[PDB]
């Protein structure tokens with residue numbers, strides 16, 4: 001018996017590779033927007049009032065050449081920049097950031113069901129924090145945007161169809177979240193309605209592995 | 211006997227007004243850059259690998275009309291977006307974010323000595339966390355950039371003198387930090403040298419009030 005989502009947390013991660021490789025997180029971005037920014041609003045500017053967290057993470061293994069080409073990250077470069085692994089302090093930081101947002105929380109990620117949600121659950125499981133985000137909800141924006149539009153349903157393809165130019169910085173987690181936000185601002189009332197109707201408990205997401 | 215700063219945390223806050231008004235924080239942005247991004251690098255792009263935290267904060271009082279005009283924030287709007295006050299959870303979040311960066315840490319803020327540093331110390335003092343950032347260092351970028359250039363020494367004026375266009379989004383904490391970073395990337399080796407030579411313990415910054 002959940003109510004209306006109060007915060008939409010636009011969410012994207014980079015990783016060492018695709019799911020079949022048992023990947024690890026290399027970058028994450030959370031962009032928390034209060035529902036009022038969508039309910040009561042060429043390309044729309046982001047809301048003035050948002051919370052943002054963008055962090056790089058040292059994975060415990062090498063990125064694949066393909067992963068490095070598309071994400072612009074490598075394990076060696078992350079290490080040169082002194083990045084720390086996905087550890088208890090990181091999980092605590094994520095939770096403290098989420099706690100600054102009104103509940104209910106809904107993570108919104110493009111192909112989140114395939115990529116971002118199961119990998120986040122796997123990282124948390126490795127720390128023994130298997131219930132840390134049980135109270136959050138989640139939606140996959142490709143599922144939402146397909147349903148609403150009813151071709152390619154990549155961020156870039158959607159954005160270009162809606163706006164005309166290409167999105168900026170397609171190759172970072174932050175760039176992806178910002179493009180997703182812009183898409184979500186096209187018809188924001190409808191998007192928000194769909195999320196409220198379809199949000200799933202994060203606890204129902206199985207870890208990608210382990 | 212401190213060594214070389216390992217992380218430069220470009221830092222800007224918005225507040226309810228100027229120091230003589232006993233102001234409170236309304237927005238903060240931390241952009242942590244590893245020294246290697248400056249030491250071993252028209253307008254330079256930001257480094258690929260950075261950590262960023264941008265948060266809005268509910269102050270315990272109204273912003274002045276002048277503050278609202280220049281920052282684009284008001285107490286009522288922050289409240290409509292469900293923002294929380296500057297509390298223990300916030301202080302913990304800030305520390306957890308800083309702990310993901312290699313030490314020594316140096317906060318870098320434009321007119322930081324007048325604005326950002328004393329107000330941060332005042333907020334922490336109100337929570338009884340008077341030593342929380344004792345291990346950090348700080349530099350005021352107006353002091354640095356004056357010394358290095360050796361007219362207006364605002365962010366916009368410097369940026370325009372260095373690059374040609376105007377900076378983007380002069381009216382947000384994040385916009386300010388990003389412009390500051392761009393300025394710092396002009397002659398980054400010299401900037402970094404100056405910081406290492408002049409960094410001050412954050413503990414020597416007196417609270418703005420109280």
Ligand SMILES: CNc1cc(CN(Cc2cccc(Cl)c2Cl)C(=O)c2cc(F)cc(F)c2)cnc1C(=O)O
Pocket residue numbers: 012013014015016017018019023064066067070071110111114115116117119154155176
């Ligand atoms: C097609 N669109 C996406 C693809 C990915 C998969 N990638 C990037 C990647 C793309 C190609 C080849 C490779 Cl080798 C890699 Cl790594 C990830 O970084 C990624 C992240 C995750 F959170 C868990 C995961 F398994 C992979 C992530 N997000 C989107 C998006 O639309 O936001």
Ligand SMILES: CNc1cc(CN(Cc2cccc(Cl)c2Cl)C(=O)c2cc(F)cc(F)c2)cnc1C(=O)O
Pocket residue numbers: 222223224225226227228229233274276277280281320321324325326327329364365386
């Ligand atoms: C002139 N440049 C700046 C001025 C301020 C002062 N302001 C903005 C403001 C400007 C004018 C009139 C008003 Cl009424 C207000 Cl509020 C703050 O928001 C501010 C923040 C602090 F951290 C503590 C403080 F006391 C004020 C902050 N930063 C810069 C900068 O260069 O980054």
Ligand SMILES: [Mg+2]
Pocket residue numbers: 012013110115116176
């Ligand atoms: Mg993605």
Ligand SMILES: [Mg+2]
Pocket residue numbers: 222223320325326386
């Ligand atoms: Mg400032």
